């Protein structure tokens, strides 16, 4: 991606990194893999 | 499915504040392990 | 990881967390999996 507007235009979400420095972009499928207690609650793709 | 913020904390999942779009993202410790990986060796047992 | 600089030295990036205590660390592999719309775009190791 080029500019932060392209993040939201795509539908991807972007979060702010403060402790180290930077900016990481979170996608929908990334959200599911992020919220997983064990092997069962990852999305079907993974 | 978590109705209130306390539900995420009570269940043990972490919740990262979200900038720009969206409102919030919920962190699972497996997701954190997946998040914290430099090489395909460091991925958890699942993936 | 003992101290914060070890995260930065290793190339890891660390975000700050509001709702609940913690400091989630992000890796380069952690990046693209997070930025995923669907099953198409994840690293081949996934």
């Amino acid at each position: 991606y080029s500019d932060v507007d392209a993040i939201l235009a795509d539908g991807k979400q972007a979060v702010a990194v403060k402790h180290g420095g930077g900016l990481v972009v979170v996608g929908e499928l990334g959200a599911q893999v992020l919220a997983a207690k064990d092997v069962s609650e990852l999305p079907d793709g993974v | 499915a978590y109705s209130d913020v306390d539900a995420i904390l009570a269940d043990g999942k972490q919740a990262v504040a979200v900038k720009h779009g969206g409102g919030l993202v919920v962190v699972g410790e497996l997701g954190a392990q997946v998040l914290a990986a430099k090489d395909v060796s460091e991925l958890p047992d699942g993936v | 990881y003992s101290d914060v600089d070890a995260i930065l030295a290793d190339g890891k990036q660390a975000v700050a967390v509001k709702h609940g205590g913690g400091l989630v660390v992000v890796g380069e592999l952690g990046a693209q999996v997070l930025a995923a719309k669907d099953v198409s775009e994840l690293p081949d190791g996934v």
Binding site: K18, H19 | - | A16, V17, K18
Partner: protein
């Protein structure tokens, strides 16, 4: 120009100890060539 000098003012959940500093500059720019026929340009190679 804004400046968030390190100390109490930069105290938050991200840096509870409040050690980071910040300074940003923002501005708006635009231009319109009313008469491009008046703008002239010659190209050449130098020594």
């Amino acid at each position: 120009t804004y400046t968030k000098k390190p100390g109490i003012e930069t105290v938050s959940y991200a840096d509870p100890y409040g050690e980071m500093g910040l300074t940003s500059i923002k501005w708006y720019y635009g231009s319109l060539i009313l008469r491009p026929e008046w703008i002239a340009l010659f190209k050449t190679v130098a020594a």
